[PDB]
Scaffold this active site. Structure first.
Site, PDB file in Angstrom:
ATOM      1  N   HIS A 141      -8.485  -1.240  -3.929  1.00 15.02           N
ATOM      2  CA  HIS A 141      -8.393  -2.642  -3.531  1.00 15.02           C
ATOM      3  C   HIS A 141      -9.095  -2.919  -2.202  1.00 15.02           C
ATOM      4  O   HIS A 141      -9.393  -4.068  -1.929  1.00 15.02           O
ATOM      5  CB  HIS A 141      -6.934  -3.154  -3.552  1.00 15.02           C
ATOM      6  N   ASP A 151      -4.942   4.044  -6.851  1.00 12.44           N
ATOM      7  CA  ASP A 151      -5.598   3.159  -5.899  1.00 12.44           C
ATOM      8  C   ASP A 151      -6.452   3.869  -4.867  1.00 12.44           C
ATOM      9  O   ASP A 151      -6.057   3.986  -3.704  1.00 12.44           O
ATOM     10  CB  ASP A 151      -4.540   2.261  -5.216  1.00 12.44           C
ATOM     11  N   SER A 187      -3.407  -0.131   4.384  1.00  9.89           N
ATOM     12  CA  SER A 187      -4.010   0.200   3.088  1.00  9.89           C
ATOM     13  C   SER A 187      -5.173   1.194   3.321  1.00  9.89           C
ATOM     14  O   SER A 187      -5.988   0.961   4.206  1.00  9.89           O
ATOM     15  CB  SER A 187      -4.577  -1.062   2.448  1.00  9.89           C
TER      16      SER A 187
END
Ligand code: I87
Ligand code: I87
Ligand code: CL
Ligand code: CL
Ligand code: CL
Lengths: 695, 697
Positions: free
Chosen positions: A63, A205, A630
């Protein structure tokens, strides 16, 4: 519990060693030498990444690298859907507008900044938090021609602890960062929006980039002559896995926290920010979902807008669950009452005066802040025709020379961008009727944007008629209505256009509310400088971490699951079996990659499966993370990479105000799963060969 | 796998039960020649289980089992369904019309007797061996001349077991004066409501209290003000010791039906026809219903119960199909039949293989018909309300065609019209449901197989289902109140004979009955082949680890108090607590409202001797016992036979357990007796009920 400054590692080291840390202090962070800190990067301004090879290979989330994967995707080579695996360095794709930032040096400049600040004079000055002012101080300290004498390097001073501590960062920025690999979206985004903020999680991810530089390893913009960067430090990859209670630590760039909120700020965050966002987004999403479920074409056009609205809606639900069930308000009240009692004993009333100033500012801005969130959630983001074209002063002073044709072409381009392939006037009329009905019930007539007064005055309270009239008479109500205006354009037609007047009226109120509310931030900020100074003078800088501010921090904890509710336990680790349980071929979010399904059926896990023969996917830890974390490296007790942080469970989102030891977890993709995907799905052996994998 | 054992099988199971934790003596649990714990178990009101818990005939069962009785005594002045009911004296206990409690006085194996009587075979294909009428004639012959008159209150019944390979005679004692004593408010009794049906973890206090009354001598008697509480042969002692993970638990009750001896082809049929059609058709019906209920609050009020009634077997079918897909039910039946076929080949007896082949051939032959039957039943009979609109009888049509019997016929038709178009019926919602249901039905059922009136969709309406449905209501006598009244004023047989709604209803019921009558003959060859199939299974592997299918008779099951992992990285423990009730509280959702007296007990920790060792208040627990519908209200016993809870549900993941027990997923959901006693005590304040129970420390 905290997001600690690198300077605080010396003070936390003994606690970390007791919790399981085995590596030496200066191997993790060394202020005058190479350390693990040197392998961490700020990836593209808002994510974290990590260097994992002597040739500048970088790991981050899928992402985080999503926009780069999408920019290189076409109908002939859809990398977003099928993944991407450059089989040679020369096949790695350059990215425009990308950056990776290394934190070369960090220095405490508190005494210097506080001495420079003594020359202000005006006590209420906000220069102490001004990026422009602090940059002038950073430039003065680094030197006149610093970036010329040290190319690729830059300096920055930031305030911490509400302006009680200042740090200068020397940054090295690289802008030639190429796409190397990415799993298909079915792996990289397996949960899609359904599993966002959810633990257990089964999402792989990750995405892979490579930093390129000039022949000397110095930053350089994209050039065909650029060579991969040989960094000072890179992470070794561990294949030993994780077990429950194992020590885990993260380095990254958490963006924002509100650890020093008063109890009145927690009440305001709940009763205004969160309740309005929840109430307004539920109305918007409810109408949108009804329409998307009734028409497959509406589902295609509105899926992304629906998903974008849901993300902060779920965050607000998780945050309000914490305020309701974890006593956040009460714990802030106890924190401020303890400081006030200690201040009374020392004969210093400034801490109690500071908390009182925050409470008085919060209470005074209540109606305005409510009106602001109501218009922002209800209209600005709630109704698409609020962002319809508003003719500029230049455009109207052209319609009433042949520059009339140029004004119409500019207005046309904006109309075409508003009424695009994904815009439904019918869905928007339905959403606006529900959103304005709520808005008109909450905002009194004398506080309405001027055009909305027509609902009571001209339309006898009929919101449906008011909205129908906007579209029936507006030049932006349909393509035929625009073309009829474009053929015979009059400025009197635009000045009386119901949609133009609506859009202008609502944006005027949104800006008037913003400008009236902005002055209330400064007394709160000034009072927080005194409040946090008292908290630190009373209980010390250890247990109470500085609020996140997009700067490099470390956090430590353990690999541990939690109990979300009575009689339910979520363990610390998910497996490939969990991906297969979730497979639904006729639901795009839960489709399973056929190459991955085959690996699972054949048990072709190689050296990546656990001792039981089960393939791990993700794990969770008691580390303290937030947005900005992240892609963060997750390290072992020995500093070896064991995973990448990619999310946090909804139950822990209130952790930005109060850390929740029994609920809050960082959701991490296991590095063994990352390698299994690179190996058995991507077949990109060269990436495995350049990494230093420890048995 | 794990079973529902006959009382006769307790002897051969006892050593396994003792090694699993059972401490009580065999004959204290069941004795064919004396008083035992079996004597404290009752069939409550025909389909639930209950248990006697005092020397004065006090009975415990589920709240959902005593629901109709609580509702029948509820008024606006005394709403017992909402506020609970607690009779403070025996004289205040409320009588119930049409209630019964059945005791299993004696059980006797009559296999040799029934098999000898059956040898008088006029036809080898006779189904008398499974006929309730035939078996009752054998039961009456064995019991004696007018047994019911010589032994008032007692009755005799013979049932077939193991597909007709074992017969038992039951001597039953029935009591019909069973009074309501106590009930928690619905907020406790049905706390999860429909949201938590089939769900574990579960936080529902699903119990209600009754009392058996009898004549002065303890003999059954219908309601009379002169009736006195029953002093029973046996009652359960209540345990306060609670439960811990891995503790032995056992249940006695009346499981209704199982399909443990299905062939692999019957599992495939159950999935591909029964379950897939029910799932597909109910999802269409529920989807339209939910959209209408969410758009209009008045539609939500009118359709909430119909929506909830449809969802219950829909969720069951989803759980059953999950087991077929993920637990290898088909494969395990295939392995069961292949093993019998191999053993039959070695024994020189081909009859077992011939029996399995007959079942497969019957299943394959009835496939299209069974598909058409489920399609019309789920799609139209159940799916569309105007399928159950009035159809004029042969006598009503005759009355309309010169006497005062015309107004008699119209008043009868009117009463049925008024019952169809009641306060909960929306013609608009029904037209929407019918358009979606018929669109699916017309796509699945070919023209030559349609109910005659449905052929008009292609023939008269050019395939427009909406126009066909609109026309039914626009022209029908039952399309609106004004349309009925206009017919009622000037009634003609010819108007009814050509009425589009009458023709639709008649047409669909004609097809439903023709399919039923054509399918009925296929049951008999399967039943006869199952008698041979199960005989082979029992002769090969014994009546030791393969239990007889449930048939509403008294059974025991044993297991342990244990949770399970529903999916990757998720564990559901064995016990819920009062904190779980408080976490679920939502005051603006009727299903999750918390009783204020209960919320106060939790805040004050007023748990008395009912809390567990750690000071936590238990609510419910789950066990690896094997239960099914009919087991609601069943006593859950300790290793010592003391009552530790009442069974009230089973998790959806274990519903495939009616075909194949699922050790890692299937659990009985039980209300903890400590929570029952806490509610009676701190919520009901009904101390006299605690005082008459024998509570062991
Ligand atoms: C499946 C969807 C519809 N949700 C029930 S959810 O699990 O995503 N949920 C996560 C957080 O609490 C709610 C705000 C939504
Ligand atoms: C949306 C889901 C999570 N449900 C609320 S459900 O009631 O549909 N569901 C519960 C589990 O068992 C299934 C058979 C039914
Ligand atoms: Cl470097
Ligand atoms: Cl034979
Ligand atoms: Cl299982």
């Amino acid at each position: 519990e905290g997001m600690w400054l690198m300077q605080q590692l010396g003070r936390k080291y003994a606690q970390m060693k007791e919790r399981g840390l085995k590596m030496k202090e200066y191997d993790l962070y060394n202020p005058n030498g190479t350390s693990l800190k040197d392998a961490v990067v700020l990836f593209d301004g808002g994510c974290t990444g990590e260097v994992v090879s002597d040739r500048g290979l970088v790991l981050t989330n899928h992402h985080c690298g999503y926009d780069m994967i999408q920019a290189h995707s076409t109908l002939e080579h859809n990398y977003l859907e099928n993944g991407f695996w450059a089989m040679r360095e020369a096949d790695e794709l350059p990215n425009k507008d990308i950056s990776v930032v290394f934190i070369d040096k960090i220095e405490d400049v508190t005494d210097y900044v506080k001495k420079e600040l003594k020359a202000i004079k005006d006590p209420n000055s906000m220069d102490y938090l001004s990026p422009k002012y602090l940059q002038k101080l950073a430039d003065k300290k680094a030197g006149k021609n610093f970036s010329a004498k040290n190319p690729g390097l830059s300096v920055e001073i930031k305030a911490f602890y509400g302006g009680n501590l200042y740090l200068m960062f020397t940054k090295k920025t690289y802008t030639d960062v190429r796409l190397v690999g990415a799993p298909p979206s079915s792996i990289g985004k397996f949960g899609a929006d359904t599993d966002n903020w959810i633990w257990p999680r089964h999402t792989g991810d990750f995405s892979i980039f490579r930093i390129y530089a000039d022949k000397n390893g110095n930053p350089a913009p994209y050039s065909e002559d650029n060579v991969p960067l040989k960094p000072k430090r890179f992470f070794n990859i561990s294949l030993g896995g994780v077990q429950e209670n194992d020590y885990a630590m993260i380095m990254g760039f958490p963006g924002t926290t509100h650890r020093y909120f008063t109890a009145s700020e927690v009440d305001e965050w709940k009763s205004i920010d969160n309740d309005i966002r929840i109430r307004m987004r539920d109305i918007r999403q409810g109408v949108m979902l009804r329409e998307m479920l009734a028409d497959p074409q509406i589902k295609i056009m509105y899926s992304a807008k629906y998903a974008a609205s849901q993300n902060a809606y779920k965050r607000a639900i998780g945050a309000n669950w914490a305020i309701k069930t974890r006593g956040l308000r009460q714990n802030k009240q106890a924190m401020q009452d303890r400081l006030i009692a200690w201040g009374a004993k020392q004969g210093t009333p400034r801490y109690e005066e500071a908390v009182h100033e925050i409470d008085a500012t919060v209470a005074k801005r209540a109606d305005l802040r409510r009106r602001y969130w109501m218009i922002e959630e209800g209209i600005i983001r709630g109704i698409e025709f609020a962002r319809s074209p508003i003719p500029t002063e230049d455009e109207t002073k052209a319609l009433q020379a042949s520059a009339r044709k140029e004004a119409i072409d500019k207005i046309r381009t904006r109309y075409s961008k508003f009424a695009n392939k994904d815009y439904s006037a019918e869905v928007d009329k339905k959403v606006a009727v529900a959103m304005l009905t709520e808005y008109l019930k909450e905002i009194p007539y004398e506080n309405l944007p001027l055009h909305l007064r027509l609902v009571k005055d001209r339309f006898a309270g009929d919101v449906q008629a008011y909205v129908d009239d906007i579209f029936a008479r507006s030049v932006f109500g349909s393509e035929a209505q625009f073309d009829a205006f474009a053929a015979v354009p009059s400025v009197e037609k635009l000045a009386e256009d119901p949609m133009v007047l609506f859009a202008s009226s609502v944006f005027d109120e949104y800006r008037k509310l913003y400008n009236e509310l902005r002055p209330y931030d400064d007394p709160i900020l000034r009072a927080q400088r005194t409040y946090i100074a008292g908290l630190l003078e009373m209980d010390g800088d250890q247990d109470q971490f500085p609020d996140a501010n997009l700067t490099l921090r470390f956090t430590y904890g353990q690999v541990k699951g939690y109990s979300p509710r009575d009689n339910v336990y979520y363990g610390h680790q998910t497996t490939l079996d969990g991906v297969m349980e979730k497979e639904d071929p006729d639901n795009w979010e839960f489709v399973v990659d056929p190459k991955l399904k085959a690996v699972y059926e054949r048990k072709d896990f190689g050296r990546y499966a656990d001792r039981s023969g089960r393939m791990p996917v993700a794990f969770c830890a008691t580390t303290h993370t937030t947005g900005g974390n992240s892609g963060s490296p997750v390290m072992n007790a020995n500093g070896e990479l064991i995973g990448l942080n990619f999310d946090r469970n909804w139950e822990g989102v209130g952790g930005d105000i109060q850390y929740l030891a029994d609920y809050q977890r960082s959701i991490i993709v296991d590095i063994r799963y990352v390698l299994l995907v690179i190996d058995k799905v991507g077949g990109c052996q060269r990436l495995l060969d350049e990494m230093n994998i420890v048995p």
